[PDB]
Amino acid sequence: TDLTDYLNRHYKAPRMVLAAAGGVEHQQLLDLAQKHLSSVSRVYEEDAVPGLTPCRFTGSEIRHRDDALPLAHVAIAVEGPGWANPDNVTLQVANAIIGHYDCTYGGGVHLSSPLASVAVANKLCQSFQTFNISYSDTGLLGAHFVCDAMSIDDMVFFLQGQWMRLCTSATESEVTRGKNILRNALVSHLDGTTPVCEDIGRSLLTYGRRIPLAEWESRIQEVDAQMLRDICSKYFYDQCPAVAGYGPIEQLPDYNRIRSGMFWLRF
Amino acid sequence: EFGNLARIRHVISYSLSPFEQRAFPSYFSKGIPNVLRRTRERILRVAPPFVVVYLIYTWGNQEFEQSKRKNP
């Protein structure tokens, strides 16, 4: 009965997108959708409107200590803007400044990202990856790294320094490199029918419309180092992060050291 | 030496930021019963030696003021 009434009150036509990508005729699929999908019972049966309650980001720390695991995973994330705010696009460029690194990368030492270069130069991590998840009016922007125990504290310091570099020492060169990387990411991802259809469905569900890729290029080209560094000062400086850990995480610091490291004393 | 101190398995710790919590969350109304509980649990082992030696001090000063008193 719970599955039945959940399917009844949640599978409704105004909250449904039928998306298609590829060798498709639009009029034929519109006719077939009018033939098949015109039976939804969209009327509110119990007049219960499911509204989006605005969630609150709480700066907290969960740690799961279990010392038999070979490697430790730590994720640190601050609150993101959301889908509707364009500033995450700028934050996307910020992730393209920080990038990602694995132990199987063929670049070696001369990678352009300074965190990846100091990770391979000092043998810090198995891997790290920068993520920006967005939800309705909220989100999580941050990093996730897997490493051995005896490096964890040190690597945290390096990661925080890179974030504060994005607050202060952003130059034209790494901003242009992040712009080019983000351009290659947003055009190279939309290859084949499945990711294009996924982009269409997620765009009509989140933004309410399909943003053209030329508009994405116009939004990407509008950023420079000044606005990137003031958005990074707006979203990273003197903020309360969320820390999750799993593995040999004894050297993973408390909330006080991380919170102190998320602001420099020189300014 | 954080990292090679002990071996603990399957434990979860939850904590908050100091900026999303109160510095004195129900200070007096939750602090007075705990202080009274600690005092009730420790005063029966701390106080009676101090009471006995206060009695010893008062007896000693009473004898010192009662030392001669113009003895008949």
Binding site: - | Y14, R22, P25, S26
Partner: peptide
């Protein structure tokens, strides 16, 4: 199961 856990209510400490 890691989905079986959730944070406790910190309502007496939170602002």
């Amino acid at each position: 199961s890691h989905t079986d856990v959730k944070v406790p209510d910190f309502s007496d400490y939170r602002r």
